[PDB]
Swiss-Prot record, chain C:
Functional summary from the UniProt entry: Component of N-methyl-D-aspartate (NMDA) receptors (NMDARs) that function as heterotetrameric, ligand-gated cation channels with high calcium permeability and voltage-dependent block by Mg(2+). Participates in synaptic plasticity for learning and memory formation by contributing to the long-term depression (LTD) of hippocampus membrane currents. Channel activation requires binding of the neurotransmitter L-glutamate to the GluN2 subunit, glycine or D-serine binding to the GluN1 subunit, plus membrane depolarization to eliminate channel inhibition by Mg(2+).
Parent-protein start and end of this portion: 542 to 843 of 1482
Subcellular location: Cell membrane; Postsynaptic cell membrane; Late endosome; Lysosome
Protein name, UniProt field: Glutamate receptor ionotropic, NMDA 2B
Modification after translation: Phosphorylated on tyrosine residues.
Source organism (scientific name): Rattus norvegicus
Swiss-Prot record, chain E:
Annotated spans, Pore-forming: 2-23
Name this protein carries in UniProt: Glutamate receptor ionotropic, NMDA 1
Segments passing through the bilayer: 30-46
Gene that encodes the chain: Grin1
Role according to the record: Component of N-methyl-D-aspartate (NMDA) receptors (NMDARs) that function as heterotetrameric, ligand-gated cation channels with high calcium permeability and voltage-dependent block by Mg(2+). NMDARs participate in synaptic plasticity for learning and memory formation by contributing to the long-term potentiation (LTP). Channel activation requires binding of the neurotransmitter L-glutamate to the GluN2 subunit, glycine or D-serine binding to the GluN1 subunit, plus membrane depolarization to eliminate channel inhibition by Mg(2+).
Protein species of origin: Rattus norvegicus
Domain comment, as recorded: A hydrophobic region that gives rise to the prediction of a transmembrane span does not cross the membrane, but is part of a discontinuously helical region that dips into the membrane and is probably part of the pore and of the selectivity filter.
Chain sites annotated for binding glycine: 87
Length: 148, 180, 281, 98, 93
């Protein structure tokens, strides 16, 4: 079981054309784009109906998954996070036992095997979740409107 | 400083000059060819002065298409003028690269090399600032060697290029380089 | 030296403006007969296209010569356009020569170019141990260029005994920082083949892995790594956003524009014998 | 084109597959990911997504020019040529009856 | 050489080669000499003008990075932030 979140550079989320169908398109490089179904709600707003449909997804990370597939061959289903976020620690509104939410959360709870995502590598999560070598090198930055 | 003058030489390479003169007389010969196929020496005169743009002013090419040939020619002449212009741009703006000496955070000073030598007066209050700290400890460790008795001596020494740099209090030195 | 400025940066100062120069130039040619009451117009306003060349006498037309004043302001204004073009030469340095890529073509076939090209790395290179998988012929040909030690290699690049050099980005960056003068840099922005990194491996099949893991994790926790490179990786040189400059006004490319000239004169020979052929009927 | 990266780059970081606690899958996966980075597979991934540059670089540019200014100058030129036809006829009449 | 004169200096500043004739008076011809000099000065004027028309762009865009004094002291002026519940924030915590 694999989980992620809509994220601009990597995840692309569009509905199926009729049902379960994803428009087959090529690249600027002419590549026969590989895509697959994905489950998650289309809401993104808090406090709204959570009912989920499989829409289509494609992207970078998705590719990396397929690379795993041709590498380690096994069945997989892919879904997003209940919320629209990654995750943070916290406690319950009462009695304050350490808890979690987010992709981390569905993982610790066990709702999925796999988190495929531009995952920040921290100290804390590794005190829970295992790590790989990095598959990309990114870092912090800031963004603002270009000069007129 | 190493930036000045070089005169008529600076704004080109010898090869370019070979192109201008040699190919100039060449296209001149082309003009004379356009004359005798269907103002002989006066032609090469005309294009030569054209590249000179000095207004020799004898006459012009008769053949219309050939007159267009010389037209593009004079265009390329303007291109050569502009060439001299951008050349001049190189002859002025965009000076040489950094002088280093960015200050106490200069990586240069951060890792002492036999390359550059920077130090201060033997028994300097400056050194006293340098004595108790964690960071310079490498530096203070490196700076006992070449320190001098009187800063004036240092001025002399770097002034002889026997020093890369010297450490002191600013105002004094502002006075110094302000002098020399 | 460079850079790659074949006189068409002036066209960046203009581009379709020139098209307007043709068309509106013909408009002025119409203005000649208009204010009159053929090629004279051409040599005239085209005379204005730069400093006067064609000796041809100015048109005696008062209002006509006033139009000549119009194309005169147009002309000096255009000279200004080329002034700012030279300005475009002032800034605008590509600072790009041999930079292509790890798998790119210019390095793909060593025998391809005329002058012997050579690049490579040290033996037993981890990076190289990847390079063998990158392409075989590469290791094969570069075997003759292998070198012992990093320093004298650098000295051979500065001296010119070798073109370029293959290694990990590490010493490229740091060594790039430290040099007597600022000269060398990696190709491109730092695009790196074999995305990888340094770390600390240990005795296999331990538990101490996770522990040290969380450790240097915490090392980015304080972000002390900032301090760390600050004491080490900090460079003086580069900041390649600045384009540096050149001198000597050495242009083979602009000479290329001169080749556009001469070739245009050849076209003039073509149409020359052509119109000569039009003289029969 | 509307936006620009920040000046510096900080908080060295990276991305690896999320997996829980201890399951053997870690080694296999990461080993495989080296098994990509060993070759241009990743760079290929740029070619699939990151590589495509929709706009120019960060720039701030040295310079460039398009027809706006020259449209104004050449405009006063041509409108001055028509003005030269108008006043041309006018002065033509003046000197004609002078 | 009456109206043709103002013609001559007008075109001189134009430097377009009207080319009717010249000033006869030697001292006055020196007057026009200095004149044409100042014309060249006006051309160069257009040149340096163009220099302004190209190099030396506008001032800084700020955003110098995490050490930007701007970010160091929050103002209602500029607003800089991140995602609610961001691993980034986790670094910032
Ligand atoms: C790279 O590794 C090779 C072996 O993998 C080294 O080869 C040895 O080189 C020394 C001197 O060059 C010889 O005396 C040995 O006989 C070589 N052994 C083998 C197995 O080839 C080589 O020296 C290493 N590179 C460098 C720069 O030392
Ligand atoms: C809660 C919500 O926003 N749901 C949207 C809505 O358009 C619809 O229920 C579904 C199927 O199109 O797509 C999603």
């Amino acid at each position: 079981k694999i989980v992620t979140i809509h994220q601009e550079p990597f995840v692309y989320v569009k509905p199926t054309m009729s049902d379960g169908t994803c428009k087959e398109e090529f690249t600027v490089n002419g590549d026969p784009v590989k895509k697959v179904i994905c489950t998650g709600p289309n809401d993104t707003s808090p406090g709204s109906p959570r009912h989920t449909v499989p829409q289509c997804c494609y992207g970078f990370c998705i590719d990396l998954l397929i690379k795993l597939a041709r590498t380690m061959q096994f069945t997989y289903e892919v879904h997003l996070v209940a919320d629209g976020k990654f995750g943070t620690q916290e406690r319950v509104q009462n009695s304050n036992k350490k808890e979690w939410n987010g992709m981390m959360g569905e993982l610790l709870s066990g709702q999925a095997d796999m988190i495929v995502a531009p995952l920040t590598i921290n100290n804390e999560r590794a005190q829970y979740i295992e790590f790989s070598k990095p598959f990309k090198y990114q870092g912090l930055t800031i963004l603002v409107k270009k000069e007129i | 400083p190493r930036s000045t003058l070089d005169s008529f030489m600076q704004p080109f390479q010898s090869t370019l000059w070979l192109l201008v003169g040699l190919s100039v007389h060449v296209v001149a010969v082309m003009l004379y060819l356009l004359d005798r196929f269907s103002t002989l020496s006066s032609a090469m005169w005309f294009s030569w002065g054209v590249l000179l743009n000095s207004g020799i002013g004898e006459g012009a090419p008769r053949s219309f298409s050939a007159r267009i040939l010389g037209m593009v020619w004079a265009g390329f002449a303007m291109i050569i003028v502009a060439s001299y212009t951008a050349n001049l741009a190189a002859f002025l703006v965009l000076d040489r690269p950094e002088e280093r000496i960015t200050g106490i955070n200069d990586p240069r000073l951060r890792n002492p090399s036999d390359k550059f030598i920077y130090a201060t007066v033997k028994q300097s209050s400056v050194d006293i600032y340098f004595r108790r700290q964690v960071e310079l400890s490498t530096m203070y460790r490196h700076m006992e060697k070449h320190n001098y008795e009187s800063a004036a001596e240092a001025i002399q020494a770097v002034r002889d290029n026997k020093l890369h740099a010297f450490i002191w209090d600013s105002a004094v030195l502002e006075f110094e380089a302000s002098q020399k | 030296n460079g850079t790659v400025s074949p006189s068409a940066f002036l066209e960046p100062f203009s581009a379709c403006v020139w098209v307007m120069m043709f068309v509106m130039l013909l408009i002025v040619s119409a203005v000649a007969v208009f204010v009159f009451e053929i090629g004279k117009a051409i040599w005239l306003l085209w005379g204005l296209v730069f400093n006067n060349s064609v000796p041809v006498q100015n048109p005696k037309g008062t209002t006509s010569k006033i139009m000549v004043s119009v194309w005169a302001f147009f002309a000096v204004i255009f000279l200004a356009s080329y002034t700012a073009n030279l300005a475009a030469f002032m800034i605008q340095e590509e600072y790009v020569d041999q930079v292509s890529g790890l798998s790119d073509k210019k390095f793909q076939r060593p025998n391809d170019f005329s002058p012997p090209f050579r690049f490579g790395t040290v033996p037993n290179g981890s990076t190289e141990r990847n390079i063998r998988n990158n392409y075989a012929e590469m290791h094969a040909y570069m075997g003759k260029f292998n070198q012992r030690g990093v320093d004298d290699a650098l000295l051979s690049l500065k001296t010119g005994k070798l073109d370029a050099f293959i290694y990990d980005a590490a010493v490229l960056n740091y060594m790039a920082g430290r040099d007597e003068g600022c000269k060398l840099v990696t190709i491109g922005s730092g695009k790196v083949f074999a995305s990888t990194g340094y770390g600390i491996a240990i005795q296999k099949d331990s538990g101490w892995k996770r522990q040290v893991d969380l450790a240097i994790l915490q090392l980015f926790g304080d972000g002390e790594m900032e301090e760390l490179e600050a004491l080490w990786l900090t460079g003086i040189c580069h900041n390649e956003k600045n384009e540096v400059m050149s001198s000597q006004l050495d242009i083979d490319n602009m000479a290329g524009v001169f080749y556009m000239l001469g070739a245009a004169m050849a076209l003039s020979l073509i149409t020359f014998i052509s119109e000569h052929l039009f003289y029969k009927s | 084109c509307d936006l620009v990266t920040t000046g510096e780059l900080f908080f060295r970081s990276g991305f690896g597959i999320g997996m829980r606690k201890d399951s053997p899958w870690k080694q296999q996966v990461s080993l495989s990911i080296l098994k990509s980075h060993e070759n241009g597979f990743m760079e290929d991934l740029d070619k699939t997504w990151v590589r495509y540059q929709e706009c120019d670089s960060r720039s701030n540019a040295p310079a460039t020019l398009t027809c706006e200014n020259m449209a104004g100058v050449f405009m006063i030129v041509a409108g001055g040529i028509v003005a030269g036809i108008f006043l041309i006829f006018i002065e033509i009449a003046y000197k004609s009856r002078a």
